[PDB]
Amino acid sequence: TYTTRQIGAKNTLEYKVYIEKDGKPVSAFHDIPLYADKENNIFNMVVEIPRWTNAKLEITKEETLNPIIQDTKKGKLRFVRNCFPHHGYIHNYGAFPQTWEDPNVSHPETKAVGDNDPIEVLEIGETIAYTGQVKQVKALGIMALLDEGETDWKVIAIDINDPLAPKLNDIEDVEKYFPGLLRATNEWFRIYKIPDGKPENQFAFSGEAKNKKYALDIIKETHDSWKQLIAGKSSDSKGIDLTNVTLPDTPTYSKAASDAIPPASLKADAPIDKSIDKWFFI
Amino acid sequence: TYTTRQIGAKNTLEYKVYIEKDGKPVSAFHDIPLYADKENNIFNMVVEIPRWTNAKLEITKEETLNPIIQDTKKGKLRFVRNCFPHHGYIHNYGAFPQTWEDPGDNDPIEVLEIGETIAYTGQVKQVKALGIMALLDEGETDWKVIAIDINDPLAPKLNDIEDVEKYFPGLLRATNEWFRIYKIPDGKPENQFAFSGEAKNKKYALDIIKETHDSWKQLIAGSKGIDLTNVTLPDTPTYSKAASDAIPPASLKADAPIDKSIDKWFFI
Ligand SMILES: [Mg+2]
Ligand SMILES: [Mg+2]
Ligand SMILES: [Mg+2]
Ligand SMILES: [Mg+2]
Ligand SMILES: [Mg+2]
């Protein structure tokens, strides 16, 4: 059973969330199986950012066992800004573990190198998720985002426990049950860093949401990149911490790395600066 | 100085917020002057509902000193549902005190405050009026004043309704949409606007505000089941300073959980 171990107060520099199995930390990047049910293409999603929140919480590639920590921009806590008509992130946002957008090769669909992170996941179900949650999802489709010119695919997915899950099997079903969501998703990922002073992003395929079959193919590619990475065989692993506690055939296997993690020290959420309330009209 | 006194846990039937002046409860309907600066048309707004929340909190006309409580229907706490692409209420939402739509919807006139900062329930902030829309909900006229906190960084650039279009492009469209559809998930019909949903200008809004203030002047001087107790207007029949002292002390209870169903995004 997966649980979380929180260090510190949310919305601070000291905040960390480790994922635990049997009450002991494992790598959120490496040790959670991509597949909950391989035969039925049910995936484990690691949730990073709940819907309608701002704090840019992410799996930290360079820290041992890859806890979720808030990103910083020049030393300051990063919060994604509200871009009208949206409030923070408009999906439960996270990643598939055991995947990598390989930065060392140009990807043919986008003609761009990978962004060096796990493939990311937009989970569209009704219940708001929590940071460090491992939930089980079905893939519905995928969008080819170029995030500051880097390949940054976004998988469209739904929690298998969602009341609608049985009715959502491919990307066209998203438009049927969530009309406007995919178009809003396109806008969101285009504009969300404009308030940070960054350019608009762009999508390949004029932002088309490719179907499930397409999505599975790309998820496979990223899993395969990760398999090379974790084996120590990437041409450049970018100083990623490859320490893991469940993959005995890898050079960086270490069951003991788990014991070295501090105990939970959960504190109440710290206040967020009122600037983060601001609604930007772009 | 205005503060708040909270009784109970948020998101419960027991929750009440009173406004305090220098530590003493006063009526949120009657004791807060409509005008912070009459000469320059600066109004006091009583905030009921923060932007991006769901709990339908309102000044209750029928309880002494008119605390803000959660609305209910047949015993059940009311939460406005999330209507895509909106998250809860899209404005800081509240009322002008010392106003009354004499039936006409029987309530103070409501205020959509459009500034950047999210407000708090029971906050008395100072705003300038920019415009007004006339919502029709169940045969009742339901005026909504568009306003901005005078402390907002943009307040000096916003003086009339056309400035909302320039600095907040799409907000007026979203407002029209929101108030049309927000009760469809509850099983209620779509609402409609007068004037084909046009936001009338500041002048038109000031005329409505003054009118509803004149009505309330009649009300408080002595009424469909409204408690008129006040603690700051000594020559009113219902003046009673002891009312302030009869209010329980603050509870410091943490917010109660809200049922997960309220998370749901409706596509309507
Ligand atoms: Mg980044
Ligand atoms: Mg990046
Ligand atoms: Mg990415
Ligand atoms: Mg009502
Ligand atoms: Mg009304």
Round to whole Å and give the CA distance between A264 and A57. Answer: 18
| Cα separation values, A198 from A170, A192, B30, B137, Å | 33, 9, 49, 43
Tell me the residue range of the domain where A22 lies.
Answer: 1-282
Round to whole Å and give the CA distance between B34 and B37. Answer: 9
Per the listing, tokens 């916003």 go with: B158
Shortest distance between the Cα of B196 and any Cα of chain A, in A, equals 22
Which residues are close to ligand 3, an ion, with C-beta < 5 A?
A: A 115, 117, 120, 152
Q: What are phi and psi of A79, to 5 degrees?
A: -125, 130
Contact B267/A90, CB-based, under 8 Å?
no
Round to whole Å and give the CA distance between A36 and A43. Answer: 5
Round to whole Å and give the CA distance between B61 and B78. Answer: 17
Contact of B87 with chain A, judged by CB distance below 8 Å, is answered with yes
Can you give the CATH number for the domain in which B209 is found?
3.90.80.10
Shortest distance between the Cα of B267 and any Cα of chain A, in A, equals 6
Round to whole Å and give the CA distance between B233 and B132. Answer: 29
Q: Reduced to 3 states, what is the DSSP secondary structure of residue B214?
A: helix
A115 C-beta neighbours (distance < 10 Å), count: 21
A89 has catalytic annotation: yes
Q: Is A161 exposed, middle or buried (0-12, 13-18, 19+ CB in 10 A)?
A: exposed
Comparing CB atoms, the residue among B90, B169, B264 nearest residue A281 is: B169
Per the listing, tokens 């960084």 go with: B153
Gaps in chain B (C to N over 2.5 angstroms) fall after 103, 222
- In chain B, how many domains are there? 1
In chain B, how long is the greatest CA-to-CA distance?
52
- Strands B68-70, B192-193: pairing kind: unpaired
The answer to whether the beta carbons of residues A142 and A119 sit under 8 Å apart is no
CA triple A106-A89-B263, angle to 5 deg: 140
From the CA of A223, how far away is ligand 3's center (Å)? Answer: 14
Q: How many CB pairs under 8 A join A and B?
A: 48
Q: How was this structure determined?
A: X-ray
Contact A178/B263, CB-based, under 8 Å?
no
The answer to whether the beta carbons of residues B21 and B15 sit under 8 Å apart is no
Contact B84/A180, CB-based, under 8 Å?
yes
- Kindly state the tokens that stand for B204: 């038109």
- The residues near A169 (Cβ < 8 Å, ≥ 6 apart) are A138, A140, A212
Q: What are phi and psi of A113, to 5 degrees?
A: -65, 160
